[PDB]
Design a protein around this ligand. Structure first.
Ligand code: SF4
Length: 215
């Protein structure tokens, strides 16, 4: 064909430039129309960090605060994650942090105090995955921490259950570079609930971060 058929016809793939440079990738994501989420979001929120990072962390999506900060993990969940990283003795300079989808999907409720996140469909996750693959091949992390169900399923499969594999180092044969994978609870889940449950859950997140950092 004058123009061939191929992966560039699906999802975000044709918006991803043939460069591993994270600044160029982030600039290009600002123009992505790979699914419908770019329309109502303020901006794309690419990952943050550098290519020497040994640990990559992936959440679900930018939330209300991130959508306007332009940066991942800035809101209350990000502050809880910072507390856990510090308890786990993990250097922020060793991290590249991002999300399975790069545009905030949301609604409002009258009387609300924030835009309410809505779950990306598996269709949206698969559409945005080209960016995640670009990030992973750019950074070459030794280990990927998957924060919550959307991010864990993005790499481990749509049937994967975070709740059934806590503490475990995983490897799957179609992830570029074959990094270790550790799936854990998303920090937003630890913000609410009875104290004893939040405290036990926090300790478990610190444990999983420490497993990842010991890879
Ligand atoms: S969520 Fe991902 S695939 Fe969809 S428009 Fe945004 S960057 Fe592109």
């Amino acid at each position: 064909g004058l123009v061939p058929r191929g992966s560039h016809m699906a999802g975000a793939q044709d918006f991803v430039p043939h460069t591993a440079d994270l600044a160029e990738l982030a600039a290009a994501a600002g123009e992505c129309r790979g699914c419908g989420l770019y329309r109502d979001a303020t901006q794309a929120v690419f990952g943050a960090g550098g290519r020497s990072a040994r640990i990559m962390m992936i959440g679900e999506q930018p939330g209300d605060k991130e959508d306007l900060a332009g940066l991942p993990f800035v809101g209350p969940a990000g502050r809880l994650l910072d507390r856990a990283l510090e308890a786990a003795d993990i250097d922020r300079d060793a991290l590249y942090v991002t999300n399975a989808v790069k545009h905030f999907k949301f609604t409002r409720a009258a009387g609300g105090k924030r835009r309410i996140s809505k779950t990306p469909s598996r269709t949206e996750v698969v559409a945005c995955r080209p960016w995640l693959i670009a990030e992973m091949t750019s950074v070459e992390p030794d280990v990927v921490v998957l924060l919550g169900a959307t991010a864990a399923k993005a790499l481990l499969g749509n049937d994967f259950r975070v709740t059934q594999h806590r503490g475990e180092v995983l490897h799957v044969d179609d992830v570029p570079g074959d990094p270790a994978l550790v799936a854990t609870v998303h920090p937003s889940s630890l913000l609410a609930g009875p104290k004893e449950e939040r405290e036990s859950a926090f300790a478990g997140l610190v444990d999983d971060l420490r497993v990842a950092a010991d890879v």
